[PDB]
């Protein structure tokens, strides 16, 4: 897709008429299950200008979700610290505490959590009706009530609960952030919950699934293709598959975001094609900015750090 | 490693002292769990020379294992039919019933089963303490009691319980067969159970783990290397990782096989490298024969089918 | 080409006005040359349900063409058995007798032949006026009377004469099938001869030659571009190259097919692109069905075996 | 090379008798050229807990070398701040000020400089006798006095003079750090200068040149091979090429390092192969530690940040 | 862009209003530096049929440009000999004198020169305000006056002055030739100077710069993309970049060429895309002819030698 | 293999006892069959310093062999011109008359011929008993009397009868030259016939077949490996295959060469590996010289032309 085409690219929403009903039912599941947040301070870490906490809280179905919570060292009044909540890339994990340093040295608290079952210490306790393709995208794909990303989305909202359980945190100054899957999950946390003030998705995955699969996006979108290869080579269940996926689709989530958003889009990206990123961005309901990186694909953006900082200082 | 060294290659066993104890505990756990076999005749399949059953039995933890059970059509006396159990490759499934025809046309019954959680309708109900690398090789890798392949090997022994429960089947004429993961599973079945008379591993996976990994074998062995990359970059838990895997290592299973064995090894194979295949082959306790395909890798072997037919006709 | 355009794609036929006269003359060559069939029962083969014959008969120019002819065991009444003729892929051969087991267990005969000069025991005794590119697609390319595929199309017709010469065979129940080049040869056999009742081409090669070269199909179509590279850099003989190949083109054959046809088309195929396959399917002159496999390329299709067996049970 | 041998690989020093005399003459010539340091406070950076200066100093031939110099915010006591000098990888640059954040938040000053002529605003004003291969590895390669890395190794040392000219900086607590080319530059700086107290090379480039080229390392070592291709196909000038490179070789620089060294070595690295890194490590004249990452090549080492930081805290 | 559109493709010229004034200011400053042309006869080169000279003249900034100059043997009259000047590919050099033998066996003189800085003995003495990407495409890119190909273009013209100052040579029968980079230089040579009678560009590089970058052409055009990556990720300096490059574009030069031009264009070339070559061709102002090699990419064209010889004989 | 042991690598000759008898017999038949050479002068070729002839002679089995025969223009005394015979690379052809110009300008006659069946107008009249792999390496491989290179070798010896039958040629000053397959044919022409004075093989193909195959050389040796994949997966026919190829092997030919030889060997060559070329070099019987190009693979060698020209001046 050429560029002035991408910038007006606004395909029709795929949300089923029961989208909000499905979600507030899923949120009722979460409301009945307490956080039971365990927070243990790490004192053997060499950075020293920040406080580092090892965190675990219960997901809606009892899965213990692990994170790192970091603050500036020193005394903080109740409701004084802004907070950034960071979600991570497909197969990754909470990372190391020092990657939250930038946020803490701006005066902010920050949280990085594991996505259940991925390459960390957080397991996946949900049960699925059938097997799948290596990875997570195809687990429970035939029914949205059992789909892998239902409990993931709920784990991501309960991270906002954890931050607001801390009295030093200012609940009116929450940003959600992430690259790729991380960016998908920030769109969903800002789409499903009212509390986030800013969203900063970078090349978000989990957007416009039908198109992503159709144009042979690389990376984890190929799992959905491999699903059809093994389960349904004539595409007879195609409709059930894309219907299930519509409830988690970032484009549908974007139509319900009122938070101010800064999106980063990379024009040579073949894992999260920019037409899927622009699909979501142009359905954003609140004010928004975009950074277009013409010659970058799915990879590190060291220059984007400073743009995110400016944005946060201006509006958080 | 050159061919004449391949066949003198007999590295030390890595079985811990309690290998047999770990397994007969896991087996006694399976012995308390009835199979609850359900069978259902497929009506209107194009082949009318065979009867085809859609089959489900419970694993030891209650997971419903699906399969296909195929016999020559018509009457058979109790205890008359020899039987072949087929196990499938990594990520695959029970396949299609026409792939078991060959066996039925030789007057045999045959069963193919799903491996739990892979590309089939058979899910994985076991719980793991942590997440993992996409795939199944790293689930529960820190403790053999909770490791993925524990319940897989038990499902595979329970496939022998299923075929032995068929009244038409002759329980003294059972063969176990599979390629790659399939071949590893057939060495497990024959290693952990006395009933199989023949074992037909094709390029068996799950053999000589520490060598597979260190010589940088491609395919699923790479998940173990990626475990290290994410969880343990200085290899401080390498000892626990390879002691977990030793309980499941086909080289240690081979040492308890008394069945007559026909192994295929492909000399250009970078996925199940031939030194790891030879290492298990050179520890087989019973009679054995090998087919060496010099210019083939990890790929379909059209000529091998005939070689297995002759072996089966001669000895089963 | 996008799926909705693909299905309606029906380009102009390239057949020259003397297309049927050429083939009439080429068939008169075949009429001069008797078969001299030799049939020899294969002994000690492990499948005892079937009788397997090792077969040779002469091509029109005298080339000994070898095959496997397989029947159900025991005697059969004159004219009783339906028969399947199998043609193989580019560089392949007659295969192994066990690959025709499925047809015998359905109560049918079957025949698999070598294509002349390819990777079996059947040489190519035709003489060509010039050299060529490695392979067979460019031999004699400047004159259809001397082109590689004339004597090949005639050996394919003579395979049908071989089967009708068998006492047990029913001439009114002949099917022809094959994949890739075999699919092309099946199209040729049904379009040039009236005897075949069914045709089952899978992603057929030798279709819409000028398109297949122009869009840069991989695999053997590349030999034609290489021909221009070596013999005709400026495309001065372009019109004569495409004229020669128009006489062998499956799209032209398909317009003369009255047999009922089941075609498989793989949508990601880059060796036999689907626009070229559909170009033939949409010129077929008899009843037709298509199976379209969205996420497969040029590869094995284990699900298609059952679709073919059903088609043959229904219609042969 | 297998691991235990690799850990003890200590090949013979290639330094000419000349080596210290050559560098004595090059350094004396540099000391005739004032620094002419210019420093400009960056305003309107979003962080605010650090002071950020845009920095330029003269190289020994007048080239204006650019950098970022970063301190914790506020005034500091004379001679109080430890300092980290970071040199960058092949083709890169001084990066972004936020990348020096972690050093500053430990109480340290930090300087990141451009390597002359590579991907930043610092040109290269040195003149060379011939042309060369794209890149910088082959510029002046027939004469050590005109070789690209002579003015580069002097620019790096003059970075130590710029930090020492800052009143806040403690000259007895200097650490030199870098990855790849930067690891190479760090070994040179610590080897040709007596001021660095710590060296932290990550998979250093510019070590054991003759072995690097002849085991066909990837990356910029390829430029040297291409030099032979273009200028000397039969290797008649090879002894002059390797004599030149010997004055720059990290292994020869290591035998002159008395500073305490922490080296990161990647085992699968094919750009800076592990034998070349180990050759240097085993010639280091001071106290040393190694981190050996088995499953990592030429890539980011995020776990390594924590290890450098603990090392800086115990010893800087 | 398909074949019939390619041929008519005549995009708008990008030359700025001051294009002619940029170039007569660059020539003014070239005019003031005398050629200082020196020659030197090579002794026992094995071809005795030809006179072989090792040659050196000064570029406009005193860079000494080395060449091979070849004439038919013995002494010649004043003004008798026609002459062909050959420019070389990206990163290459003057070649070997045997490569000019064919032009000399036609009773011509021939000159092949090094392009400054590339893979020969000729250095580059121009100074640039910043660094660059490895290679030469990005040196001085922000400023037309400081751009790498300014002095290159001037050295290519002064090659003309060198041949025109040899007594044997006939200034009215000058041809300029070369492949890829050489093709672009030949374009610029015949477009900036009145003297060449014939131009023979082969798949010229340095043509239609914006298009070459935007369609992801391989080879050196990718350096301009890597420039934006490293220096300007949001393309805020896109305009100055392409402006600079417009002073050097073959398209703009070709407008001013009144000489007679034979252009080889390769339809599968991904380094020098046929659209950019046809853009330059359809802007030629004098007579022209084209050879369109359909199945050739960026490579040797042994058949094109004869065509160039025919064009020369007929018109030089 | 490392260079020191390459230079002393002289493995065992694989010639059978009947190697000389085989070739005695094939040459006796060849000697009974006249050449019936036709020779027609080419007109309107732009060069003029040369006389060019289109040539055709009969092979020993009746294939018409086509070539180009080139001399200095004008008349010449009987027996006065030395001659170079050029054989081409695999899939190639006689090339263009301008590529012989170099040899003509030295005062020589030059002949380039076609290899039967390859990318020219020369067909292949031989009959083979079986099929093969695409290309010509496998044709007739189970029997030396029918092997493809038997009649090629004889046609190469008949190129010498053709040049000796020309009045102007000096039969005592024949040189045979070629690269890759051409180098193999040069070695066979010098090993089978007594007339050539010089041999100039460049990276000879057709050497030490068993090694080349078993170390996985790319290019046409891969045909022999593909022969085992298709015909003989378990290598039951490996000694018949290598016995056939031993009759054609350049290493065995080299044992019988009396002529003076200049060999170019490329050290990074993966198509014609250097140990296979050294195996031949080290069995040469007469005097010899080598040029080792250390960083070159299977590609053009523009510096080698001059060294060959020096060799020919010195010794022809
Ligand atoms: Zn959707
Ligand atoms: Zn182990
Ligand atoms: Zn056509
Ligand atoms: Zn050295
Ligand atoms: Zn432009
Ligand atoms: Zn041999």
Residue numbers in the entry:
A (entry chain B), B (entry chain A), C (entry chain D), D (entry chain C), E (entry chain F), F (entry chain E): 6 to 321
What does the published report state?
Acetyl xylan esterases (EC 3.1.1.72; AXEs) catalyze the specific hydrolysis of the ester linkages between the xylose units and acetic acid, facilitating the access of main chain depolymerizing enzymes. Here, we present the first crystal structure of a cold-adapted acetyl xylan esterase from the psychrophilic soil microbe Paenibacillus sp.
The crystal structure of PbAcE belongs to the C2 space group and contains six molecules in the asymmetric unit, forming a donut-shaped hexamer. The conserved catalytic triad residues of Ser185, Asp274, and His303 are located inside the hexamer tunnel, with a neighboring putative substrate binding site. This hydrophobic putative substrate binding site is composed of β4, β6, and β7 strands and α3 and α11 helices. The β-interface has also been identified at the dimer interfaces of PbAcE. In the PbAcE structure, the L144 residue forms a hydrophobic interaction with Y133, stabilizing the β-interface loop structure. PbAcE has a relatively more open and larger cleft in comparison with those of BsAcE and TmAcE. The B-factor distribution analysis of the PbAcE structure showed that the values of the β4–α3 (residues 93–101) and β5–α4 (residues 119–152) loop regions were lower than the average for the whole PbAcE structure. Notably, the PbAcE β4–α3 and β5–α4 loop structures are one and six residues shorter than those of TmAcE, respectively. These shortened gatekeeper loops may expand the substrate binding site area and create a more open active site conformation.
